[PDB]
Structure 1
Amino acid sequence: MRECISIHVGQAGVQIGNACWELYCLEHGIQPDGQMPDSFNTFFSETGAGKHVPRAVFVDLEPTVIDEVRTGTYRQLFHPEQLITGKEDAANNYARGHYTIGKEIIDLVLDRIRKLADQCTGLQGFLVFHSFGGGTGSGFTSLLMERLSVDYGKKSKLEFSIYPAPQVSTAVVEPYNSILTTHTTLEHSDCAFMVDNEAIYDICRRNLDIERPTYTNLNRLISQIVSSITASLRFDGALNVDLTEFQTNLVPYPRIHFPLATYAPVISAEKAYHEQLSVAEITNACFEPANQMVKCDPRHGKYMACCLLYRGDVVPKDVNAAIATIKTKRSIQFVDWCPTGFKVGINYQPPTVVPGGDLAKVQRAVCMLSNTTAIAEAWARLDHKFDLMYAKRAFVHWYVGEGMEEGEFSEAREDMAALEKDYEEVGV
C-alpha cells in the first residue's frame, strides 16, 4: 500500500543511485532481468507478470553518466522514458542549471513524475540525491524543489546531499554553489541530510583497512545508510519509524532541519571474527567523533534530538540500558529544554551484504541521524571561503553571463549569515 518516489539529480545522484538500486535488488532477491524467482511493493511496481520496475527518475544534462547505466548490467531494469538526458552540461555552475538550461528539461520530467506519482496510491514522501558543489545538483535541484511545492506542498521530501570539504575538495568554484543552493533548501526542503567525502575517506582508511578507496566504496557505504532510513517501511519489526514520524521527532524548528548521519559497525571480514559486536559498543560507535559523516566536532556540539534505527538481532531490554548509559555520560550532552531526546526504532531483518563487498556480514547495525549545534560551525568557514572569493569579484563574470543579477549574491550571503546565529540563539 505504502509508496515512495526516488529522484536522482546530477552525476553524483546518478552514481550514488545505481549502488542503492543494486542493494535493493539484492535485498528482495531480484536479478537484473527484473523477474523474481509483498515487502518490495514500495520501490518496485510489478508490471503485468514478473517485471519489477523501480520508482525512479534520473536527470542529467550530459549523456555520459546516464548512458553508463543503459549499456551495463542494469540495461534491463530501466527504460528510456525513466532516463532523461540533456545536451549542454551544467559545467560546474549554478546559473547554467537554474536559469538558462533548466527551463527545457524540467518540463519533460514533471509530466513523467506525475505519471509515476499518480500510478502509486500511498505516497509517503520524496527522496532527492545530489551535491551542493555540483552544477546540475545545485541549479536544477533548486528549480525542481521550487516546482514541487506547487503540486504537493505538505507531502514530505528528503535529500541526501554531498557537502563540500574545507581541505579535500575537487572543484574551485564550490563555495559559490553551496551558498546559492541553500536559499531554496530552507524554504522548500523538509529535512536534508549531509555527508562529506573527506569524513568518509578517513572511515574507509581506518576501519575497513583499504588504503586505496574510490567512489564505488563510498557509494556502497551511502546505500546502506539510505536503506537504514527506509528499512522501517519495507519490513515489520516490533517497533516502527515511518518518515512522517521521523520528521515529527527529529526536526524541532522551522529554520533548523539539518541533521547529520552516522553508521556502525563498518569493519573488515577478518576483523569481524575477533571483534565481539555488542549493542552497547555499537551505540558508542554512533557517538564517537571518528565515525561521523561530516567534518564536525561533537565535543563542541550539543544534540537537540537524534533518532536511532536498529536492524537485525535486537530486543528492547538492553536497548533501554544503552540509552540510559549515554544519558548518564557527560561527554555527550543535550540542550536544557529537551529532557528526553531519543527516538528508537527496531527491525528483525538483518542488513544485507553485496557480492564482493568491503563491509563484513554482521548481525546488528545502527544509524543515528542527529540534529545538533556541531554542524552550525561547519558553515562559518564556508562563509569565510566564499567571502574571500567574492571580495575581489573572482569567477563572477561567468555567472553574470548566464543571467545572474548581482543582488542575488548579496541575498544568499546575508541570509546564510543570519542563519548561523539562529543555532546560537537556540543553544543559549
Structure 2
Amino acid sequence: MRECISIHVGQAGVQIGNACWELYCLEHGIQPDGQMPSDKTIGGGDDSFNTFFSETGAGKHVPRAVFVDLEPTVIDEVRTGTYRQLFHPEQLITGKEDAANNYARGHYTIGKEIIDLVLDRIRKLADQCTGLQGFLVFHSFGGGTGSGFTSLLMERLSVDYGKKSKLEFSIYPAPQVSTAVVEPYNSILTTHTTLEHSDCAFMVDNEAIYDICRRNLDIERPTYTNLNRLISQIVSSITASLRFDGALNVDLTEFQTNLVPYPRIHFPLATYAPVISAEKAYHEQLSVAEITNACFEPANQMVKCDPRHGKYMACCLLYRGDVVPKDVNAAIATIKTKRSIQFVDWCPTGFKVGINYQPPTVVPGGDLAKVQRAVCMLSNTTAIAEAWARLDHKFDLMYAKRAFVHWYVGEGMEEGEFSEAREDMAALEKDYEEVGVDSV
C-alpha cells in the first residue's frame, strides 16, 4: 500500500536512477542480488521500504522502477552492471535509435514506436500495487528522449491513471556538460507539454551541481558520476519520508500541500547540506544550526537563482539523522533574525519541519563524507522563475532566426508548437510575478 513507481527516461534519467537505486539499497541493507537479511517478511510485507521495493518469494527485493531509453548503450550498462540482478529484464526497455537530441523524435517519430510497450510494463508494476500513490519521473530537459519521450509518457499516464500524482526530477541544462545546441528548444517544448500533467517538479540545475562539486568537494572537473551521486543524496532526502517511518517523519505529500498553492506553481527549489569532503569533515562535526544555515546560502541551491530577489510562498525543512526538534527550533529562530526571508502576504510565514531518524549514507568510493545529520530545504520561491527566464532568452535568440527549426519541422512538428510553447512559458513567468505581488 502507498507504493511509488519510478520511471527513468533517457541517459540522464537512467544514470541518475542507477545512482538512486544503489543508494537506496545501501540505506535499506539490500545486497546487489536483491536479498535483504533484515527483512523477515519473505515475499511481501507492508514496511515503509515496500513503497519502493516489491518482494519475490525467493526473498529478492525488486525496485518498483522502469528504465526506458531509445538507444541501448546506457541501459546495457545496467544489464551487465553491479546491480544487474536487482531488476528483471522486463523493467529495462531500449530501442535501437535515439532521438538525436530532437524533441520531435522522442515525442513523435521514434517515441511512438515504443510508448505502448513502456505503458504495458508500467501497468505490470501497477498491478502489483495494493494502493499505488503515483509516479516519480526522472529525465533531462535537454535530451531528445528526456524531453520528447517524457512528455509523451506523461500525457499517456494522465489518460491511463487519471489524476494519480506524477512528480518529476528534471535535469536543467548547463553549458559545462551540455551535448546539444538545441537544448533550450527541447526544454521549453517539454516544459510546456508536461506542465498540465505534472503535480510537482524538482528541477536540478546541472551548473549548480557542477559548481557545488567543484567548490565543496574539490573536484577539478566533475563527471556525471560526481554529479549523480550528489543528486541521489538530494533525491534520497526527498523520498526518505516515503521509505522510512518514524514519529517525527512528515510525508512528502504533506509538504506538497504547502508547496503547491496553484497547479502551475509547482516547482520547489531544493537546497541541501552538508556537502563536504572526507578530509574536511574529519575535523568538524557540523551541528543542526550549521547545516540549517547552509540551506539559506544560494551557493547550496540545486537551481541557480537569487531567492533574496523573490518572495517565499513556503519553506520546508527535511532533516535526516541525529536531529531533535529542540535543536531545529533554536536553529530556525537564529535564521529568522539574521536572514532575508520575505513571504508573500497571503501565506503563513512558518517553516514546516520533518525529521527522519536513519542517518544518511554514502556509496563507497565516493567524494561525499559520511555525516551524522543532513537537511534538504524545499522552498516555493518566485525566484525560481529566473531559471525559466535564462532558458526563454536562449530560445528567443535562436527562434528569431528559426535556427535548427528545420530539424523539428522535418519530423512533423509545426512552427506553431514552438510559439505556443514559448507563450506558455511567458505566461508562466508572468504567473510567478503575479503570485508575488501584495494583496489589496
TM-score range, shorter chain: over 0.9
Q: Which moved more, 1:325-334 or 1:356-365?
A: 325-334
Displacement of 1:393 in angstroms is 1.4
Partners in 2 of 1:72 and 1:330 — Cα distance? 46
Which residue in 2 is equivalent to 1:263? 272
Cα deviations across residues 17-63 of structure 1 (Å, max 9, x unaligned)? Answer: 11111111111222212222344322221211212211110111101
Displacement of 1:247 in angstroms is 1.6
Partners in 1 of 2:308 and 2:174 — Cα distance? 19
Partners in 2 of 1:325 and 1:313 — Cα distance? 20
Which residue in 1 is equivalent to 2:285? 276
Whether 1:399 aligns to 2:408 is yes
3-state SS of paired residue (2:398): helix
Displacement of 1:183 in angstroms is 1.2
Q: Which moved more, 1:347-356 or 1:268-277?
A: 268-277
Partners in 1 of 2:354 and 2:280 — Cα distance? 27
Partners in 1 of 2:390 and 2:355 — Cα distance? 37
330 and 80 in structure 1: CA distance in 2 versus 1, 3 angstrom threshold: closer
Q: Which moved more, 1:253-262 or 1:167-176?
A: 167-176
93 and 341 in structure 1: CA distance in 2 versus 1, 3 angstrom threshold: farther
Structure 1 length as normaliser, TM-score?
0.96
Identity, % of aligned pairs? 100
Structure 2 length as normaliser, TM-score?
0.94
Give the alignment partner of residue 205 of structure 1, picking from 211, 214, 228.
214
Which residue in 2 is equivalent to 1:325? 334
Displacement of 1:298 in angstroms is 2.2
Kept in 2, the 8 Å contact 1:309–1:345? The answer is yes
Partners in 2 of 1:178 and 1:376 — Cα distance? 14
Partners in 2 of 1:338 and 1:392 — Cα distance? 43
Displacement of 1:325 in angstroms is 2.5
Cα deviations across residues 273-325 of structure 1 (Å, max 9, x unaligned)? Answer: 32231111111101101111112112212221121111111111121222222
283 and 176 in structure 1: CA distance in 2 versus 1, 3 angstrom threshold: same
Displacement of 1:153 in angstroms is 2.4
Unmatched 5+ stretches in structure 2: 38-46
Cα deviations across residues 322-355 of structure 1 (Å, max 9, x unaligned)? Answer: 2222233352322222233421101111111211
Whether 1:154 aligns to 2:163 is yes
Q: Which moved more, 1:231-240 or 1:310-319?
A: 231-240
Which residue in 2 is equivalent to 1:14? 14
Partners in 2 of 1:36 and 1:240 — Cα distance? 23
3-state SS of paired residue (2:24): helix
Which residue in 2 is equivalent to 1:32? 32
Q: Which moved more, 1:165-174 or 1:148-157?
A: 165-174
Kept in 2, the 8 Å contact 1:47–1:53? The answer is yes
Q: Which moved more, 1:293-302 or 1:166-175?
A: 166-175
Kept in 2, the 8 Å contact 1:308–1:369? The answer is yes
Q: Which moved more, 1:392-401 or 1:238-247?
A: 238-247
Cα deviations across residues 217-253 of structure 1 (Å, max 9, x unaligned)? Answer: 1111111111111211222222222232122111111
111 and 386 in structure 1: CA distance in 2 versus 1, 3 angstrom threshold: same
Partners in 2 of 1:170 and 1:10 — Cα distance? 13
Whether 1:179 aligns to 2:184 is no
Partners in 1 of 2:125 and 2:310 — Cα distance? 41
3-state SS of paired residue (1:261): strand
393 and 175 in structure 1: CA distance in 2 versus 1, 3 angstrom threshold: same
Alignment of structure 1 residues 99-178 onto 2, 5 Å: 99-165=108-174, 169-178=178-187
Displacement of 1:110 in angstroms is 0.9
Displacement of 1:16 in angstroms is 0.5
Kept in 2, the 8 Å contact 1:124–1:243? The answer is no
Q: Which moved more, 1:220-229 or 1:327-336?
A: 327-336
Cα deviations across residues 71-100 of structure 1 (Å, max 9, x unaligned)? Answer: 222221122211111122100000111111
Which residue in 2 is equivalent to 1:42? 51
Cα deviations across residues 102-136 of structure 1 (Å, max 9, x unaligned)? Answer: 22211011111111111111212210000111110
Aligned residue pairs total 428
Q: Which moved more, 1:226-235 or 1:11-20?
A: 226-235
Kept in 1, the 8 Å contact 2:67–2:93? The answer is yes
Cα deviations across residues 112-169 of structure 1 (Å, max 9, x unaligned)? Answer: 1111111111212210000111110011111111111112222211111011236764
Partners in 2 of 1:227 and 1:387 — Cα distance? 36
Cα deviations across residues 347-393 of structure 1 (Å, max 9, x unaligned)? Answer: 11111121112111111100011111111122223222111101111
Partners in 2 of 1:275 and 1:66 — Cα distance? 40
Kept in 1, the 8 Å contact 2:298–2:304? The answer is no
Cα deviations across residues 192-221 of structure 1 (Å, max 9, x unaligned)? Answer: 011111111111111112223211111111
Partners in 2 of 1:175 and 1:284 — Cα distance? 34
414 and 16 in structure 1: CA distance in 2 versus 1, 3 angstrom threshold: same
Partners in 2 of 1:30 and 1:134 — Cα distance? 32
Unmatched 5+ stretches in structure 1: none
Kept in 2, the 8 Å contact 1:125–1:243? The answer is no
3-state SS of paired residue (1:161): strand
Kept in 2, the 8 Å contact 1:304–1:341? The answer is no
Displacement of 1:261 in angstroms is 0.9
98 and 288 in structure 1: CA distance in 2 versus 1, 3 angstrom threshold: same
Partners in 1 of 2:56 and 2:186 — Cα distance? 40
Question: RMSD of the alignment, in Å?
Answer: 1.6
Whether 1:285 aligns to 2:294 is yes
Q: Which moved more, 1:375-384 or 1:281-290?
A: 375-384
167 and 78 in structure 1: CA distance in 2 versus 1, 3 angstrom threshold: closer
Partners in 2 of 1:39 and 1:288 — Cα distance? 33
Displacement of 1:255 in angstroms is 2.0
Which residue in 2 is equivalent to 1:410? 419
Q: Which moved more, 1:325-334 or 1:47-56?
A: 325-334
Whether 1:239 aligns to 2:270 is no
